């Protein structure tokens, strides 16, 4: 694990999780990329160094730290054209920001285009010396950490414009293809008799997936960086993402058991091997799992979710209860995603220099009909009606710069204003789904909320809420590289993004 | 092949064409409809028993056999509330009309709403005894013709207005999606030393096709049912409802070859044989292609297409020069297209009906501002503006019961007055283009022109051009069966519809 201070440097590079190459963006040789850590209060000091060469995967960069804050350090957030321009090839910049709030599960992706696909992804872990948590386990370091990505054999921006899911599903960065069935499995070792916390990680381009481990249960303590009374299941929804922390009890037989994480489409299930993992217990022979499948006796719902700790719902206890209450309406013309009559087209200004070049009405700030301007120490409730013209349904919108409450879940037709759990990524479910949430804008700056399957991401199914604006310069100060970053990007020919 | 005497039952059931599992309208048990023929002179008595249970995808029906000009028997057409009203299930319907003076390639498919989407929809040829270019080759039949089909997961009534391209691309019937990715391929045979008349006719619901097979090269000889000059070519850009005649030469080695039509959009490429088919010839192992597609040196332009027999453009070599020029400006109001700021409205009582009761004046028919009268025995000059105000570019517009000349095609400034393609299907192309068409008023009645992309037809993007409207009735003479269809329908249940 490298950080808090640390060097990222990317590159392109052949790589083989599926035992297939293709070339992909990766960070200090990896991909996924390395995992970065820390602790609850350090400044993260993380030197991002773009050594790109692939065009085509795109030489451009600019770095996501996903579900972070950045409170006073909105320049540092990362979504391309929002909170500031590319890096270039061949240049570095340098994230500078602190987590003295917050702890827990974690990543980064990159957030320009669907350059995270290609490879630019990975895990982010701060732990916490007074983890509420801590007691619930023994063992919580690098080897409990466990990434979901889905993988394609086409990059991206060579491959369809929305991928029908994945090729393989890489568990801690391998697994197989049905093409590849004697590719390596990745192996997490554990010791009969010890208690782990293991973390895991969506890092989804796409698909959600559904997460078991054959013969064994799993208790929650964690959902996207916000504790959890503990709660038993045995399955678990991710979507594209989202974080669980779960504790596992190695206390089976020694034996080989399969982990297992089913995508919602691509290439599905397990013949062969396919999207699975294995379990090793200390001491157990070499070899792949022949444990079987159960019928889930008890999957995870949202709505079983609580705050270990009691968390407030802003606003009053009914809909509509709060200071700025928006609804998103989805649409599509075949080929652009659209909410409220509007797709995201990212502007050539980013919206920050836009809003420190003085720019404060949402009139004034581009593009016009994508950015809602908030008030300050204000509630705000968000619905988000699941419609049969947003296709790829189920969306996981994801709000950047909060972690915010969910009052509605999908499935659910009850509203929750009591104890809800909080996240920063949600499933707005099917048609028949008002999936509906609430914050306080209590964190001046442009946050985007978009969907996360990237590729609506890409064919703009997104807004910004630009929050605070007359405050947002002065509370969010600007270090000089930042303001060199539009200057520098704007020289370069189109053959060089 | 069936007919020129035939019932075509049609039901509900599941089919797995791309091996995924979904139900669909069938017609005597099978999606694509059975490749119905006769030849030219026949009398064609289709009687149409409508069997369906499944309201989702419309209890009840049109059928409309594209490409004929259906002259004298106007009410056989097809096109719901303009040419009929629908057939209710529990109820027959005998479609009865000749085919003196036409040869080629057809199809048919339903004209009620997006009812063909879901399946209801397949060839028919007309073969003549006298085909002026059947010296150019060997063998032609069941086996030649070559249907393309864009294919869906979800219904159309179930999925979104405008739908992110197709989910497999089905030939002869059978496909992969990405996901299905083993399923049954069409196999579509030759004999080494043989040569064939391939009928390529695009079924499609939405996108256009991009056609190719490997290390062979194809002699177009009919389009859209006219005959033309012999055009060697190696790639086919068929828009939806276009149909081509070409002639492959079997003279490669025995070997598997893959046959390429690449949507528009959707699921596009090539990635584990999607969008593809095998031409095998006889002897070769029973397997995959391993052949390459190579940028095509002489892909087909419209422009270069001419008739085999001399065809006099109407009016007089110059915009506007005939004795009715029109001009359809595209609009689109987010979920509706219009021409003209009106949007087709399918009115209560058809478009027929109406001119039968003595309707004959612009003024009198319903929808007001979608119907335009036409002189008889006069020149009509369209043309159909590309424009960013109707996205989903190129739209193919069709004329039903007509030809018409192509006197300029899209990706060209140029007119040709002189000896320019027929056919009844046009792609109107991108902005910049302005396509246009020349016909002769020489057949009363309310014919269709719309564009042919089915979920733009149902968004309202359709005008109907009533020509000779005093002449209609008498020309026009109408069955039993045709005026109680009227009666039968306005008594059902929404529920039945
Ligand atoms: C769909 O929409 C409307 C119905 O609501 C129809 O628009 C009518 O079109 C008529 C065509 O005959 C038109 O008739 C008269 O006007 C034209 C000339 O109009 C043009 O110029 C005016 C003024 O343009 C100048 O001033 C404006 C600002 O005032 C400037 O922006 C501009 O740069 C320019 O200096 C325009 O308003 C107008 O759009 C035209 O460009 C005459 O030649 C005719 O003889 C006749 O007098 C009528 O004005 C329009 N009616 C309305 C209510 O706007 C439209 O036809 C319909 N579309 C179809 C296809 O049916
Ligand atoms: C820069 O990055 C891109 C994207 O990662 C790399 O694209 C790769 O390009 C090659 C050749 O165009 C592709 O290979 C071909 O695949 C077909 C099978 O469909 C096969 O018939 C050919 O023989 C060949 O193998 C390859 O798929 C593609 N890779 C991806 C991931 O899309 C490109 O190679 C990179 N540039 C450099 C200099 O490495
Ligand atoms: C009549 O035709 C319609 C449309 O073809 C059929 O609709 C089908 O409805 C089922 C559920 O009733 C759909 O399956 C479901 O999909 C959800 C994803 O949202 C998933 O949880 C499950 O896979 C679930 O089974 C199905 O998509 C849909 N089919 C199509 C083609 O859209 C209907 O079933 C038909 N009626 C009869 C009586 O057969
Ligand atoms: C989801 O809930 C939202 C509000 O919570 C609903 O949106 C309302 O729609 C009406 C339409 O008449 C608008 O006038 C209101 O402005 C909306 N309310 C708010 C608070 O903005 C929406 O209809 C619901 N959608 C579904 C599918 O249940
Ligand atoms: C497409 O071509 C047609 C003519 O072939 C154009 O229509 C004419 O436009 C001029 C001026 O705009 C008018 O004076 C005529 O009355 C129009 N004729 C008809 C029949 O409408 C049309 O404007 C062209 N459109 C584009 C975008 O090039
Ligand atoms: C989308 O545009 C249409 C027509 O322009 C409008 O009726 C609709 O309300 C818009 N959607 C919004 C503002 O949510
Ligand atoms: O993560 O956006
Ligand atoms: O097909 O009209
Ligand atoms: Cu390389
Ligand atoms: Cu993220
Ligand atoms: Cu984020
Ligand atoms: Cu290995
Ligand atoms: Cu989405
Ligand atoms: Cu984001
Ligand atoms: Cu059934
Ligand atoms: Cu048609
Ligand atoms: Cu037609
Ligand atoms: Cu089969
Ligand atoms: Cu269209
Ligand atoms: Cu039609």
Redesign the pocket.
């Given at each position: 694990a490298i950080g808090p201070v640390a060097d990222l440097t990317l590159t392109?590079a052949?790589v083989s999780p599926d035992g297939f190459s293709?070339?992909?963006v990766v960070v200090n040789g990896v991909t996924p990329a390395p995992l970065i850590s820390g602790q609850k209060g350090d400044r993260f000091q993380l030197n991002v160094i773009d050594n790109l060469?692939?065009?085509?995967?795109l030489k451009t960069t600019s770095i996501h730290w996903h579900g972070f804050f950045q409170h006073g350090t909105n320049w540092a957030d990362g979504p391309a054209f929002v909170n500031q321009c590319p890096i270039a090839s061949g240049h570095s910049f340098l994230y500078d920001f602190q987590v003295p709030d917050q702890a827990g599960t974690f990543w980064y992706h990159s957030h320009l285009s669907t350059q995270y696909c290609?490879g630019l992804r990975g895990p982010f872990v701060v732990y916490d010396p007074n983890d509420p948590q801590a007691s619930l386990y023994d063992i919580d370091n690098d080897d409990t950490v466990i990434t979901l990505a889905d993988w394609?054999?086409?990059?991206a921006?060579?491959?369809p414009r929305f991928p029908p899911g994945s090729d393989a599903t890489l568990i801690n960065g391998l697994g197989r293809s049905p093409g590849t069935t004697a590719a390596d499995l990745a192996v997490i070792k554990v010791t009969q008799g010890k208690r782990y916390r293991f973390r895991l990680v969506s890092l989804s381009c796409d698909p959600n997936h559904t997460f078991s481990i054959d013969g064994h249960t799993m208790t929650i303590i964690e959902a996207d960086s916000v504790n959890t009374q503990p709660l038993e299941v045995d399955s678990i929804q991710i979507f594209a993402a989202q974080r669980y922390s779960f504790v596992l009890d190695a206390s089976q037989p020694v034996d080989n058991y399969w982990i297992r994480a089913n995508p919602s489409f691509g290439n599905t299930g397990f013949a062969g091997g396919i999207n699975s993992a294995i379990l090793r217990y200390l001491g157990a022979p070499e070899i792949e799992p022949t444990t079987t499948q159960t019928t889930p006796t008890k999957p995870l719902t949202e709505v079983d979710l609580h705050p270990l700790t009691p968390m407030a719902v802003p606003g009053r206890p009914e809909p509509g209860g709060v200071d700025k209450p928006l609804n998103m309406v989805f649409n599509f013309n075949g080929t652009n995603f659209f909410i409220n009559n509007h797709s995201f087209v990212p502007p050539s200004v980013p919206v920050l220099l836009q809003i420190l070049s003085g720019a404060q009405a949402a009139q004034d700030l581009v593009p016009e009909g994508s950015v809602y301007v908030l008030p300050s120490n204000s509630s705000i409730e968000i619905s988000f009606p699941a419609t049969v013209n947003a296709p790829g349904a189920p969306h996981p919108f994801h709000l950047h710069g909060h972690t915010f409450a969910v009052v509605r879940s999908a499935g659910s037709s009850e509203y929750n204003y009591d104890n809800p759990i909080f996240r920063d990524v949600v499933s707005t479910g099917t048609p028949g789904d008002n999936v509906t949430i609430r914050f306080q804008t209590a964190n001046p700056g442009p946050w985007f909320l978009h969907c996360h399957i990237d590729f609506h991401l890409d064919a703009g199914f997104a807004v910004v809420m630009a929050e605070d604006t007359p405050d947002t310069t002065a509370a969010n100060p600007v270090p000089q590289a930042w303001s060199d970053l539009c200057p520098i990007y704007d020289a370069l020919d189109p053959s060089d993004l």
């Open positions: 392109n052949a293709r070339e992909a060469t692939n065009h085509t995967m290609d394609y054999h086409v990059a921006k060579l491959g």
